[PDB]
Amino acid sequence: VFLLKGHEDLRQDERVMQLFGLVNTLLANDPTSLRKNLSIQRYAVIPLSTNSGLIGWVPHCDTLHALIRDYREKKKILLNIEHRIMLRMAPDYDHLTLMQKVEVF
Amino acid sequence: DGNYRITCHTVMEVLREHKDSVMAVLEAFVYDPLLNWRLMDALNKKAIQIINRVRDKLTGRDFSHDDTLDVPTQVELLIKQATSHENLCQCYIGWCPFW
Amino acid sequence: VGSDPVILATAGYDHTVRFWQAHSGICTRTVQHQDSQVNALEVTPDRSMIAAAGYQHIRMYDLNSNNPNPIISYDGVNKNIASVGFHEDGRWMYTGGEDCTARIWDLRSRNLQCQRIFQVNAPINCVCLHPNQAELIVGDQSGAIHIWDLKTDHNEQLIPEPEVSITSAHIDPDASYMAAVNSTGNCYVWNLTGGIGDEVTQLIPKTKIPAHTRYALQCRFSPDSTLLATCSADQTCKIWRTSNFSLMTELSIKSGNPGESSRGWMWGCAFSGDSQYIVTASSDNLARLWCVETGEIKREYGGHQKAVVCLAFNDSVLG
Amino acid sequence: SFHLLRQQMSLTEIMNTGLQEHTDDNCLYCVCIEILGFQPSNQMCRILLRKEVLRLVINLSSSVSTKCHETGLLTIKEKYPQTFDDICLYSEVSHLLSHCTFRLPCRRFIQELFQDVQFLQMHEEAEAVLA
Amino acid sequence: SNTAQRLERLRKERQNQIKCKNIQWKERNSKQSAQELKSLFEKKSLKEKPPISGKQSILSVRL
Amino acid sequence: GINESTIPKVLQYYSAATEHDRSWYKAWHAWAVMNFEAVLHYKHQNQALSKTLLMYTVPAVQGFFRSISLSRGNNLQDTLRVLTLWFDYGHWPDVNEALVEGVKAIQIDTWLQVIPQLIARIDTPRPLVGRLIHQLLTDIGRYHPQAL
Ligand SMILES: [Zn+2]
C-alpha cells in the first residue's frame, strides 16, 4: 500500500530519510545506546517528478489529533473546550499583547 | 526528569562525538543548486549562515557565542525554552499549544 | 461630562470604557470601542480629551460633550501600542509600539514636522517621560533600558540583567529615583540624573528589592515621591517607602480558598493628589479603591462584564 | 495610459479628450454635426473623472471582483452626480458595451446609472433644426 | 430601481462617516533640521525646584 | 587550534602514523580529513593560488579512497567527502588520474548509497568532470540496473 502525492516536492523528503538512516547506524554501534534500543522509524519515499511523489504507507499508525478526538467524543467532551474557554474570557485573543496572552492561556 | 532527560543526554553526546558524519550529509543538502531555492526566501550567502548555525548547535555555542556549554547544561536550557509559557502562547491556534 | 475636579475611567475586553466617580459608585457614562481591546489609557494635561490606544489605532474620545464615538483617531502603525503620553504643555504625543518603534506624534494640524522615530531591536513594553520633559525611557523585551534624550539623537543602553523582559518604568515627579520591574519580580532602582544643567544622564544602581515572586506587571511612583506601588501576578500589591525601601503596606485580593486558583491578576494602580488613596484595577471584572494605612478597601466598581486591564485617575493639582 | 498610472496613486492624489475611442462616426451627438447641422458641444477637473469612470467599466468586464468595482462606481455618482450628464460619455460606454461581454446583472447596473438624465444638448439642437 | 435604492442607501452612512477625524502617519520629519531640533522638540524645561506641601484637599470633598 | 603554523605540524605527525601501522582506519581517515580541512582554510584566506591547493588536494583524494576500501559498510562520510572535491576541484588535470584509479580500485557496491547526489549534478557544464560521472553510472547499470 502506498500514498500517491500530488502538488508536493518530495526531493527534500528523500534527503532527510538518508540523514535518518545515518543516525540509525550511529546509534547502532554505540554500546550505551544499542542496549537501550534507540532508533528512528522511516518510510519509503520515491519521488517521480518535481511536483509528484510516492510515499510508503505505514500500517497500524494513527495521527495524534484523531487519537485524542475519539477519546473526547466518547466521554461526551467537546473537542475544543480549552479553546472555547479562552475565547469566552477574551474574544480578541489574537490581538492581545504578550503579557495579556499569558494570562488567558 | 526520568527517561526523557536521560535519553536526551545520551543522544546529544553521540551527535557531538560524530559531528563530521552529520555535517557531511547536511553540506551536500544545503549546497545543492536545484534544491536550496526553497530555502532562499551573493546567492550562496544565506547557505553559509545556515551551516554555521547547525555547527553551533552541535558544539554548544548556540545560546551564547561567547562560551561553550556542556551537554547537561544545553539540554536544560532547551527544556526550559520548549515548555515556557511565554513561548507557547505565541504559537498559532491550529498548532494547539494548549494540547 | 469631564467637568469635575476628579475623574476616573476603566477599560478592558468589554469593548466599552466606563466613566465613574469616586463619590458614588454610579457610572456616569459608557463610551463605545469596537474591534479592539484597550491596553492603556491616559488623559490630556488640559483635562478636556482622553486617549485610549489598542491594536494599531489610538482612538481619542470627547469629555465635555456626550459623544460615544472616537471623534479623533490615529493610524499608520502596524502593531499594538504599549503606552501613550503627552508633554506637560500638550505639544506632542509620544507612543510606544510593539513594532520595535517608539515615536512622537505632533498635535498641531500644520506642517511643523516635529516627529522623530526611535528604532530598537526588540518590541517595547513601557515608555516613561522625565519630569523635565527633556528625556524619555524605552524598555524592551530584552531587559535593555534605553534612555533617549531629545536634545541629541543618541541614547545610552543600560541592561541590569538579560533574558528577562521588563514590563514598566516610571520616574517620580520630584526627580528623586527611577524604578523598573521585570518578568521575575525584581524591582531595580537607579539614582537618576544629577546633572540638571546639561543633562549628563548618569545612573548608578542603588538597590534591589526582592519581592513579587510571580510576574511583575506595573510600577508607579506617587506625586509626593514618598511611595512606590508595584503590581504583581500573585494578586497582591506591595507599597514601598523611599526612606529605607521597606514594606509600608501590603494589599491583596486572595480569597484564601484553593478552589479559585488565581481567579485574576492585578494589573494597574494609581495614586491621588495627597498620596493617600489609591485606585487599583484587577482582572476580576472590577476595580477597587484602597487606603494606604487601614488596608481595607473603601469602594468597589462593578459595571464591567469582562476583565479590566487599564485605568486613568487624575484629580486637581492641589491636594 | 490612465489604466497603468492609476494603480500607483489615488483619486484624490491626482486632483491635488479623455474619451479614447470617440471618433465622429460612432457618437449619438457628434454624428449630427454634418448631416443635420448641429452645434458643437460645450464644456481639467472633468477630464480626470471620465478616465476613472471608463477604466472601471473595463475592470467590470472580467467579473473577477465585481463588488469592488460596483462600489467604486457608486461613489462617483454621489460625490460628482453631474459627470453622468454628457451624451459623449454615454456613446463611449454604449460602444464599449457592444464589443465586450458583460454579465446580465452587471449589464443592468450600467445603462441604468444613466436613467435620470436630461441630456439638454440634443433637445436644444433638435428643436432648432426641425423648426 | 435596484441601484437607485443602493445609491440612496449608501448616502445614509456617508452622513455618519464624516464625524471622525483621521490623521495618518506620513514618513516625513525634520531630517535636515539637525540644528533646529535644539528647540523644536527640545524645550528642556528644567525647573520646579521648589517643593510645595499639600493639605489633602483633593479627597477632602470626595469623602 | 587550527593555525597557519599548526597545520603543517600535524600533517607530519599524521603522515608518520600512517606508515608505521597501515590498514588502520583511524590513521587514513584522519589524515585525509586534515588535508581536506587545510584546503578549505586556504580557499577562505585567498578570497578575503592554483598551485597552492595542488599539493593538498591530491593527497586528500588518495587518503579517502584508501579509507573507503578499509571500512566497507560504514563509509557514508568518506564516500561523500570524495564527491565534494570531485565536483569542485576535479577540473584540474592532476585530479583526474587520482580519481580514475580510485573509482576502479574500490568495489562498485559502494556508490549505491550516494546515487541521489550523483543524479543531482549530471548537468555539470564542465566536460572534463562531466563524462567521468557517466561511465560509472553506466557501470552501475551493468551490475545493478534496477536501482538506478
Ligand atoms: Zn461625441
Curated annotation (Swiss-Prot), chain C:
Q: What is the effect of changing F313S?
A: Impairs interaction with MTOR
Covalent cross-link Glycyl lysine isopeptide (Lys-Gly) (interchain with G-Cter in SUMO1), where = K306
User: Pfam family of this protein, just one?
Assistant: WD40
Placement of covalent cross-link Glycyl lysine isopeptide (Lys-Gly) (interchain with G-Cter in SUMO3)? K79, K208, K238, K254, K298
Q: Where is this cross-link: Glycyl lysine isopeptide (Lys-Gly) (interchain with G-Cter in ubiquitin)?
A: K298, K306
Name the family the entry cites.
Answer: Belongs to the WD repeat LST8 family.
Keyword S-adenosyl-L-methionine attached: no
The record's subunit annotation is: Part of the mechanistic target of rapamycin complex 1 (mTORC1) which contains MTOR, MLST8 and RPTOR. mTORC1 associates with AKT1S1/PRAS40, which inhibits its activity. mTORC1 binds to and is inhibited by FKBP12-rapamycin. Within mTORC1, interacts directly with MTOR and RPTOR. Component of the mechanistic target of rapamycin complex 2 (mTORC2), consisting in two heterotretramers composed of MTOR, MLST8, RICTOR and MAPKAP1/SIN1. Contrary to mTORC1, mTORC2 does not bind to and is not sensitive to FKBP12-rapamycin. mTORC1 and mTORC2 associate with DEPTOR, which regulates their activity.
* Spans of repeat WD: 1-30, 33-73, 76-115, 119-158, 161-200, 211-250, 261-302
Major localisation: membrane
* Organism superkingdom: Eukaryota
- Any single Gene Ontology cellular-component annotation: cytosol
Mutagenesis or variant effect for T44A: Reduced ubiquitination by the SCF(FBXW7) complex
Give expression by tissue: Broadly expressed, with highest levels in skeletal muscle, heart and kidney.
Sites of Phosphothreonine modification: T44
Recorded GO MF terms: protein serine/threonine kinase activator activity; protein-macromolecule adaptor activity
Give the protein name, as stated in the record.
Target of rapamycin complex subunit LST8
Give compartment(s).
Answer: Lysosome membrane; Cytoplasm
Tell me the keywords, alphabetical order: Acetylation, Cytoplasm, Isopeptide bond, Lysosome, Membrane, Phosphoprotein, Repeat, Ubl conjugation, WD repeat
* Alphabetical list of SUPFAM superfamilies matching this protein: Quinoprotein alcohol dehydrogenase-like
What range does the record give for the signal peptide? none
What organism is the protein native to? Homo sapiens (Human)
Swiss-Prot record, chain D:
Question: Where is the protein situated, by its record's location annotation?
Answer: Cell membrane; Endoplasmic reticulum membrane; Lysosome membrane
Q: Which residues bind Zn(2+)?
A: H22, C27, C30, C88
Describe the PTM: Phosphorylated by MTOR; when part of mTORC2.
Q: What's its job?
A: Component of the mechanistic target of rapamycin complex 2 (mTORC2), which transduces signals from growth factors to pathways involved in proliferation, cytoskeletal organization, lipogenesis and anabolic output. In response to growth factors, mTORC2 phosphorylates and activates AGC protein kinase family members, including AKT (AKT1, AKT2 and AKT3), PKC (PRKCA, PRKCB and PRKCE) and SGK1. In contrast to mTORC1, mTORC2 is nutrient-insensitive. Within the mTORC2 complex, RICTOR probably acts as a molecular adapter. RICTOR is responsible for the FKBP12-rapamycin-insensitivity of mTORC2.
The entry sums up its family as follows: Belongs to the RICTOR family.
What is the official name of this protein in its record? Rapamycin-insensitive companion of mTOR
Q: Please name the source species.
A: Homo sapiens (Human)
- Gene that specifies this protein: RICTOR
The shown range, given as first to last of full length, is 1479 to 1694 of 1708
From Swiss-Prot, chain E:
Subunit info here reads: Component of the mechanistic target of rapamycin complex 2 (mTORC2), consisting in two heterotretramers composed of MTOR, MLST8, RICTOR and MAPKAP1/SIN1. The mTORC2 core complex associates with PRR5/PROTOR1 and/or PRR5L/PROTOR2. Contrary to mTORC1, mTORC2 does not bind to and is not sensitive to FKBP12-rapamycin. Interacts with MAP3K2. Interacts with ATF2. Interacts with MAPK8. Interacts with GTP-bound HRAS and KRAS; inhibiting their activity. Interacts with IFNAR2.
In the record, Phosphothreonine modifications are located at T3
Expressed in which tissues: Ubiquitously expressed, with highest levels in heart and skeletal muscle.
- What does the entry's domain section say? The CRIM domain forms a ubiquitin-like fold with a characteristic acidic loop, which recognizes and binds AGC protein kinase family members substrates.
Phosphoserine sites (modified residues)? S45
Q: Which gene is annotated as encoding this protein in its UniProt record?
A: MAPKAP1
Q: Which family does it belong to?
A: Belongs to the SIN1 family.
Q: What sections of the protein cross the membrane?
A: none
Q: What does this protein do?
A: Component of the mechanistic target of rapamycin complex 2 (mTORC2), which transduces signals from growth factors to pathways involved in proliferation, cytoskeletal organization, lipogenesis and anabolic output. In response to growth factors, mTORC2 phosphorylates and activates AGC protein kinase family members, including AKT (AKT1, AKT2 and AKT3), PKC (PRKCA, PRKCB and PRKCE) and SGK1. In contrast to mTORC1, mTORC2 is nutrient-insensitive.
Task: Report what the protein is called.
Answer: Target of rapamycin complex 2 subunit MAPKAP1
- Top-level taxon of the source organism: Eukaryota
Swiss-Prot record, chain F:
Q: Which domain of life is it from?
A: Eukaryota
State which tissues express it.
Answer: Expressed in numerous tissues, with highest levels in testis.
| Cellular localisation | Lysosome membrane; Endoplasmic reticulum membrane; Golgi apparatus membrane; Cell membrane
Q: Where are the TPR repeats?
A: 74-106, 107-146
Q: How is it modified after translation?
A: Autophosphorylates when part of mTORC1 or mTORC2. Phosphorylation in the kinase domain modulates the interactions of MTOR with RPTOR and AKT1S1/PRAS40 and leads to increased intrinsic mTORC1 kinase activity.
What the entry says about domains is: The kinase domain (PI3K/PI4K) is intrinsically active but has a highly restricted catalytic center. The FAT domain forms three discontinuous subdomains of alpha-helical TPR repeats plus a single subdomain of HEAT repeats. The four domains pack sequentially to form a C-shaped a-solenoid that clamps onto the kinase domain.
* Biological role stated in the UniProt entry: Serine/threonine protein kinase which is a central regulator of cellular metabolism, growth and survival in response to hormones, growth factors, nutrients, energy and stress signals. MTOR directly or indirectly regulates the phosphorylation of at least 800 proteins. Functions as part of 2 structurally and functionally distinct signaling complexes mTORC1 and mTORC2 (mTOR complex 1 and 2).
Q: Would you identify the family this protein belongs to, as annotated?
A: Belongs to the PI3/PI4-kinase family.
Q: What is this protein called?
A: Serine/threonine-protein kinase mTOR
Q: Which organism is it from?
A: Homo sapiens (Human)
Q: Which residues of the full protein are shown?
A: 1763 to 1972 of 2549
